[PDB]
C-alpha cells in the first residue's frame, strides 16, 4: 500500500510480451523500452508477462533478458522478474559463500523480513536448492550469531495481539537490563529469546521502556555488551523493529555515501522494497539526509541502470 511502483491500470500481458520480444530482437538491444515496461508493472503483472512471453516464444523471458542485457541493469531486471520469495531466497543463497560469507546481506534480509515472508522464503528455498535454509545458515554461520540468525529465520515470531501487554513490556525491559548492562558479561540467549519471540510493536514499547532502567539506550547497550557479527545483527534487528523505512533509508545512504557503490545492497533494496514501503523510505531519506533519494541515486549511478533505479524510486521528493 506504500510502495512506489503500483500495478499498471491498463495492463495487457500479451502486448507487453510482444513489445518486449520486439525490444529484445531489436538491433543493439532496446534497453529503454524494457525498462519503461518492467519498471511500471507490478510483480504479478511481470509474472503474467513472463508467462505470455513463454507461450509466445517457447523461451523463458529471464533467459532471453539475461542474454540481451549486461551488468548492473541485467542484475536489476533479473531481480525484478523473480517473485519476492524467489528473489530473497536467491539473494540468500548468493550471500552464503562458505567462510567468506556475505554476512551483511544475510543480516539485511533475515532481520527485516516478516513471519509470512520468511515462511514463504523457507519453502521456496527448499524447493529451489533441495535443502532447508536452516542447514545452510548453520553451515555458513557460527556461535550466538548463528543462534540469532536461525531464531529469526524460523519466522515464528509472535503476532501483534488484540491487547497491549504493558506488564510483559515492563518485565521484558527488566529482563533485558538484568541480562545486559547490570551484570558484567552478557546473557545472550535471553536477549535473542526476547528479541526474536515478542511481537514488533511490543518490542518497540519494550525498547523505549528499556530507556527507563538503563543509562544507555538499546543500540548503545548493544554496542557495549556485544561486538562483531552478533553486534551487527542485533543493531540491524533493533533498527528494523524501531523504524524499518528509516533503517532502509540508512542502508541506502550507506551504500552510496562512500567511495564507489555497494550495488548489491542498492539494487536489492530498490527491488525488494519497491512494492512495500518505498514511499516511506523516500520520506525518511529526505527528512534525514536533506536531498532526495532520487538525487543520490542520480549522482551515484549513470545510464539505463540509473534510469531503472529512478523508475523504481518514482520521482524526486
Ligand atoms: Ca550478460
Ligand atoms: Ca555487561
Ligand atoms: Ca559513491
Short mmCIF file of C-alpha atoms and ligand atoms in Angstrom, two decimals:
data_model
loop_
_atom_site.label_atom_id
_atom_site.label_comp_id
_atom_site.label_asym_id
_atom_site.label_seq_id
_atom_site.Cartn_x
_atom_site.Cartn_y
_atom_site.Cartn_z
CA UNK A 1 0.00 0.00 0.00
CA UNK A 2 3.03 2.25 0.49
CA UNK A 3 5.04 1.06 -2.49
CA UNK A 4 6.37 3.34 -5.22
CA UNK A 5 5.55 1.08 -8.16
CA UNK A 6 1.84 0.32 -8.46
CA UNK A 7 0.05 -2.19 -10.67
CA UNK A 8 -0.41 -0.76 -14.15
CA UNK A 9 -4.10 0.00 -14.65
CA UNK A 10 -4.44 -0.54 -18.41
CA UNK A 11 -2.48 -3.79 -18.31
CA UNK A 12 -2.18 -6.21 -21.21
CA UNK A 13 0.32 -9.04 -20.74
CA UNK A 14 0.22 -10.10 -24.39
CA UNK A 15 1.10 -6.71 -25.89
CA UNK A 16 3.75 -6.22 -23.23
CA UNK A 17 5.27 -9.58 -24.14
CA UNK A 18 5.10 -8.58 -27.81
CA UNK A 19 6.73 -5.18 -27.26
CA UNK A 20 9.39 -6.84 -25.10
CA UNK A 21 10.05 -9.56 -27.68
CA UNK A 22 10.43 -6.78 -30.24
CA UNK A 23 12.66 -4.71 -27.94
CA UNK A 24 14.89 -7.76 -27.42
CA UNK A 25 15.10 -8.76 -31.09
CA UNK A 26 15.94 -5.14 -31.95
CA UNK A 27 19.45 -4.45 -33.27
CA UNK A 28 21.80 -3.36 -30.49
CA UNK A 29 19.13 -4.21 -27.88
CA UNK A 30 16.41 -1.78 -26.80
CA UNK A 31 17.07 -1.28 -23.08
CA UNK A 32 14.86 1.81 -22.80
CA UNK A 33 11.65 0.03 -23.80
CA UNK A 34 12.35 -2.92 -21.49
CA UNK A 35 13.00 -0.59 -18.55
CA UNK A 36 9.94 1.54 -19.36
CA UNK A 37 7.75 -1.56 -19.36
CA UNK A 38 9.10 -3.68 -16.50
CA UNK A 39 9.59 -0.78 -14.06
CA UNK A 40 5.94 0.25 -14.44
CA UNK A 41 4.42 -3.19 -13.93
CA UNK A 42 3.65 -4.92 -10.64
CA UNK A 43 5.49 -8.15 -9.80
CA UNK A 44 2.43 -10.29 -10.54
CA UNK A 45 1.95 -8.46 -13.83
CA UNK A 46 5.60 -9.19 -14.59
CA UNK A 47 4.85 -12.86 -13.95
CA UNK A 48 1.94 -12.60 -16.39
CA UNK A 49 4.26 -11.04 -18.98
CA UNK A 50 6.73 -13.87 -18.35
CA UNK A 51 4.03 -16.48 -18.98
CA UNK A 52 2.73 -14.72 -22.10
CA UNK A 53 6.27 -14.36 -23.44
CA UNK A 54 6.89 -18.04 -22.71
CA UNK A 55 3.75 -19.17 -24.53
CA UNK A 56 4.51 -16.87 -27.47
CA UNK A 57 8.20 -17.71 -27.97
CA UNK A 58 8.59 -21.01 -26.05
CA UNK A 59 11.65 -19.49 -24.43
CA UNK A 60 11.64 -18.14 -20.88
CA UNK A 61 11.83 -14.36 -20.53
CA UNK A 62 14.52 -14.37 -17.83
CA UNK A 63 16.89 -16.28 -20.10
CA UNK A 64 16.30 -14.02 -23.11
CA UNK A 65 16.84 -10.93 -20.96
CA UNK A 66 19.93 -12.40 -19.31
CA UNK A 67 21.24 -12.81 -22.85
CA UNK A 68 20.09 -9.40 -24.09
CA UNK A 69 21.41 -7.42 -21.12
CA UNK A 70 24.61 -6.99 -19.11
CA UNK A 71 25.99 -5.77 -15.79
CA UNK A 72 24.03 -3.84 -13.18
CA UNK A 73 20.99 -3.42 -15.44
CA UNK A 74 20.95 -7.18 -16.03
CA UNK A 75 21.10 -7.67 -12.27
CA UNK A 76 18.23 -5.23 -11.72
CA UNK A 77 15.93 -6.67 -14.40
CA UNK A 78 16.60 -10.31 -13.48
CA UNK A 79 15.93 -9.22 -9.91
CA UNK A 80 12.58 -7.69 -10.86
CA UNK A 81 11.50 -10.77 -12.81
CA UNK A 82 11.65 -13.07 -9.77
CA UNK A 83 8.83 -13.30 -7.24
CA UNK A 84 9.63 -11.69 -3.84
CA UNK A 85 10.25 -15.09 -2.24
CA UNK A 86 12.36 -16.25 -5.19
CA UNK A 87 14.43 -13.07 -5.18
CA UNK A 88 15.03 -13.11 -1.43
CA UNK A 89 15.92 -16.81 -1.50
CA UNK A 90 18.30 -16.35 -4.43
CA UNK A 91 20.00 -13.43 -2.68
CA UNK A 92 20.31 -15.54 0.48
CA UNK A 93 21.91 -18.40 -1.45
CA UNK A 94 24.23 -15.96 -3.22
CA UNK A 95 25.27 -14.46 0.12
CA UNK A 96 26.43 -17.82 1.51
CA UNK A 97 29.91 -18.32 0.07
CA UNK A 98 31.40 -20.54 2.77
CA UNK A 99 33.79 -18.92 5.24
CA UNK A 100 33.77 -15.77 3.11
CA UNK A 101 30.01 -15.45 3.53
CA UNK A 102 28.50 -12.02 2.85
CA UNK A 103 27.02 -11.65 6.32
CA UNK A 104 25.83 -8.10 5.61
CA UNK A 105 23.24 -9.14 3.03
CA UNK A 106 22.28 -12.17 5.13
CA UNK A 107 21.63 -9.94 8.15
CA UNK A 108 19.79 -7.38 6.00
CA UNK A 109 17.36 -9.97 4.65
CA UNK A 110 16.84 -12.11 7.76
CA UNK A 111 16.36 -9.18 10.16
CA UNK A 112 13.94 -7.16 8.02
CA UNK A 113 11.52 -9.82 6.76
CA UNK A 114 8.22 -10.68 8.45
CA UNK A 115 6.72 -14.03 9.52
CA UNK A 116 4.76 -14.62 6.30
CA UNK A 117 7.66 -13.57 4.08
CA UNK A 118 10.05 -15.87 5.96
CA UNK A 119 7.58 -18.77 5.89
CA UNK A 120 7.35 -18.43 2.11
CA UNK A 121 11.12 -17.96 1.77
CA UNK A 122 11.93 -21.17 3.66
CA UNK A 123 9.60 -23.22 1.46
CA UNK A 124 10.75 -21.65 -1.82
CA UNK A 125 14.40 -22.01 -0.77
CA UNK A 126 13.86 -25.70 -0.01
CA UNK A 127 12.16 -26.14 -3.39
CA UNK A 128 14.93 -24.27 -5.22
CA UNK A 129 18.06 -25.79 -3.70
CA UNK A 130 16.68 -29.07 -2.32
CA UNK A 131 17.99 -28.05 1.10
CA UNK A 132 16.38 -26.18 4.00
CA UNK A 133 17.60 -22.65 4.72
CA UNK A 134 18.45 -23.59 8.31
CA UNK A 135 21.06 -26.16 7.27
CA UNK A 136 22.87 -23.59 5.14
CA UNK A 137 22.63 -20.96 7.89
CA UNK A 138 24.24 -23.42 10.30
CA UNK A 139 26.83 -24.30 7.64
CA UNK A 140 27.83 -20.69 6.95
CA UNK A 141 27.47 -19.10 10.40
CA UNK A 142 28.65 -19.85 13.94
CA UNK A 143 28.01 -19.22 17.63
CA UNK A 144 25.46 -16.91 19.23
CA UNK A 145 25.28 -15.11 15.90
CA UNK A 146 24.23 -18.37 14.25
CA UNK A 147 21.69 -18.95 17.01
CA UNK A 148 20.21 -15.49 16.45
CA UNK A 149 20.02 -15.85 12.66
CA UNK A 150 18.42 -19.29 12.99
CA UNK A 151 15.91 -17.98 15.53
CA UNK A 152 14.95 -15.05 13.28
CA UNK A 153 14.82 -17.11 10.07
CA UNK A 154 12.43 -19.61 11.66
CA UNK A 155 9.83 -16.89 11.12
CA UNK A 156 7.59 -17.87 14.02
CA UNK A 157 7.67 -14.53 15.81
CA UNK A 158 4.54 -13.85 17.87
CA UNK A 159 1.87 -11.83 16.05
CA UNK A 160 0.54 -8.50 17.31
CA UNK A 161 -2.13 -9.48 19.81
CA UNK A 162 -5.51 -7.78 20.27
CA UNK A 163 -4.46 -6.34 23.62
CA UNK A 164 -1.31 -4.47 24.67
CA UNK A 165 0.57 -6.20 27.48
CA UNK A 166 2.29 -3.34 29.32
CA UNK A 167 3.20 -5.62 32.24
CA UNK A 168 5.06 -8.04 29.98
CA UNK A 169 6.67 -4.99 28.37
CA UNK A 170 7.99 -3.83 31.74
CA UNK A 171 9.18 -7.32 32.68
CA UNK A 172 10.89 -7.66 29.29
CA UNK A 173 12.71 -4.36 29.79
CA UNK A 174 13.79 -5.51 33.24
CA UNK A 175 14.97 -8.85 31.83
CA UNK A 176 16.93 -7.05 29.10
CA UNK A 177 18.68 -4.75 31.57
CA UNK A 178 19.41 -7.53 34.07
CA UNK A 179 20.89 -9.77 31.38
CA UNK A 180 22.95 -7.00 29.82
CA UNK A 181 24.30 -3.82 31.39
CA UNK A 182 23.51 -4.61 35.04
CA UNK A 183 25.69 -7.71 35.29
CA UNK A 184 29.21 -7.97 33.90
CA UNK A 185 29.18 -10.06 30.75
CA UNK A 186 26.03 -10.77 28.75
CA UNK A 187 23.22 -13.34 28.82
CA UNK A 188 22.89 -13.59 25.04
CA UNK A 189 20.27 -16.38 24.90
CA UNK A 190 17.77 -14.26 26.87
CA UNK A 191 18.39 -11.31 24.55
CA UNK A 192 17.90 -13.47 21.46
CA UNK A 193 14.83 -15.07 23.03
CA UNK A 194 13.02 -11.82 23.86
CA UNK A 195 14.04 -10.03 20.66
CA UNK A 196 13.02 -12.89 18.36
CA UNK A 197 9.87 -14.13 20.10
CA UNK A 198 7.98 -10.95 21.09
CA UNK A 199 5.95 -9.02 18.51
CA UNK A 200 7.19 -5.84 16.82
CA UNK A 201 5.06 -3.14 18.50
CA UNK A 202 5.55 -4.86 21.85
CA UNK A 203 9.30 -4.77 21.23
CA UNK A 204 9.11 -1.10 20.28
CA UNK A 205 7.44 -0.18 23.56
CA UNK A 206 9.92 -2.52 25.27
CA UNK A 207 12.87 -0.78 23.60
CA UNK A 208 11.57 2.56 24.85
CA UNK A 209 10.77 1.17 28.31
CA UNK A 210 14.37 -0.06 28.45
CA UNK A 211 15.45 3.59 28.48
CA UNK A 212 13.99 3.86 31.99
CA UNK A 213 16.05 1.10 33.62
CA UNK A 214 19.29 1.60 31.67
CA UNK A 215 21.71 4.56 31.31
CA UNK A 216 22.30 3.53 27.68
CA UNK A 217 19.58 3.00 25.07
CA UNK A 218 19.15 -0.31 23.24
CA UNK A 219 21.51 0.48 20.34
CA UNK A 220 24.36 1.72 22.56
CA UNK A 221 23.74 -1.13 25.01
CA UNK A 222 24.28 -3.45 22.05
CA UNK A 223 27.44 -1.60 21.01
CA UNK A 224 28.80 -2.09 24.53
CA UNK A 225 27.62 -5.55 25.64
CA UNK A 226 28.49 -7.45 22.45
CA UNK A 227 30.68 -6.95 19.38
CA UNK A 228 31.19 -8.48 15.94
CA UNK A 229 28.62 -10.24 13.77
CA UNK A 230 26.35 -10.64 16.79
CA UNK A 231 26.54 -6.88 17.38
CA UNK A 232 25.83 -6.03 13.75
CA UNK A 233 22.85 -8.40 13.70
CA UNK A 234 21.42 -7.01 16.94
CA UNK A 235 21.85 -3.43 15.70
CA UNK A 236 20.14 -4.13 12.38
CA UNK A 237 17.34 -6.07 14.09
CA UNK A 238 16.65 -3.26 16.56
CA UNK A 239 16.76 -0.66 13.77
CA UNK A 240 14.18 -2.73 11.87
CA UNK A 241 11.87 -3.17 14.86
CA UNK A 242 12.04 0.53 15.75
CA UNK A 243 11.81 2.11 12.30
CA UNK A 244 12.12 -0.10 9.21
CA UNK A 245 11.72 2.57 6.49
CA UNK A 246 14.33 4.68 8.28
CA UNK A 247 16.50 1.57 8.53
CA UNK A 248 16.34 1.01 4.77
CA UNK A 249 16.94 4.71 4.14
CA UNK A 250 20.09 4.43 6.25
CA UNK A 251 21.08 1.25 4.40
CA UNK A 252 20.57 3.05 1.08
CA UNK A 253 22.61 6.00 2.31
CA UNK A 254 25.44 3.74 3.50
CA UNK A 255 25.52 2.03 0.10
CA UNK A 256 26.22 5.31 -1.69
CA UNK A 257 27.81 7.62 0.90
CA UNK A 258 31.34 6.30 0.42
CA UNK A 259 33.71 5.59 -2.45
CA UNK A 260 32.07 3.70 -5.31
CA UNK A 261 28.77 1.92 -4.76
CA UNK A 262 27.74 -1.22 -2.89
CA UNK A 263 25.47 -2.15 -5.79
CA UNK A 264 24.33 -5.44 -4.26
CA UNK A 265 22.63 -3.58 -1.41
CA UNK A 266 21.34 -0.72 -3.58
CA UNK A 267 19.81 -2.98 -6.23
CA UNK A 268 18.42 -5.41 -3.64
CA UNK A 269 16.74 -2.62 -1.67
CA UNK A 270 15.33 -0.80 -4.70
CA UNK A 271 13.88 -4.10 -5.95
CA UNK A 272 12.65 -5.80 -2.77
CA UNK A 273 11.09 -2.69 -1.21
CA UNK A 274 9.65 -1.20 -4.40
CA UNK A 275 6.20 -2.64 -3.70
CA UNK A 276 6.39 -2.38 0.09
CA UNK A 277 7.38 0.94 1.69
CA UNK A 278 9.43 2.79 -0.92
CA UNK A 279 7.36 5.92 -0.26
CA UNK A 280 8.16 5.82 3.45
CA UNK A 281 11.83 5.16 2.70
CA UNK A 282 11.88 8.19 0.40
CA UNK A 283 10.16 10.22 3.12
CA UNK A 284 12.62 9.26 5.88
CA UNK A 285 15.54 9.67 3.48
CA UNK A 286 14.73 13.25 2.55
CA UNK A 287 13.75 14.08 6.13
CA UNK A 288 17.14 12.93 7.42
CA UNK A 289 19.72 13.50 4.68
CA UNK A 290 18.45 16.74 3.14
CA UNK A 291 18.33 15.74 -0.52
CA UNK A 292 16.00 13.19 -2.11
CA UNK A 293 16.89 9.53 -2.68
CA UNK A 294 16.38 10.17 -6.40
CA UNK A 295 19.22 12.69 -6.13
CA UNK A 296 21.74 10.32 -4.53
CA UNK A 297 20.82 7.57 -7.00
CA UNK A 298 21.22 10.14 -9.78
CA UNK A 299 24.67 11.26 -8.63
CA UNK A 300 25.98 7.78 -7.85
CA UNK A 301 24.64 5.89 -10.88
CA UNK A 302 24.53 6.51 -14.63
CA UNK A 303 22.83 5.20 -17.76
CA UNK A 304 19.82 2.91 -18.09
CA UNK A 305 20.83 1.38 -14.76
CA UNK A 306 20.30 4.81 -13.22
CA UNK A 307 17.09 5.16 -15.23
CA UNK A 308 15.76 1.84 -13.91
CA UNK A 309 16.59 2.74 -10.31
CA UNK A 310 14.92 6.15 -10.73
CA UNK A 311 11.78 4.50 -12.11
CA UNK A 312 11.84 2.18 -9.10
CA UNK A 313 12.17 5.23 -6.85
CA UNK A 314 9.36 7.19 -8.51
CA UNK A 315 10.09 10.89 -8.93
CA UNK A 316 12.05 13.42 -6.87
CA UNK A 317 11.00 14.19 -3.30
CA1 LIG B 1 25.03 -10.81 -19.60
CA1 LIG B 2 27.74 -6.39 30.93
CA1 LIG B 3 29.65 6.90 -4.21
#
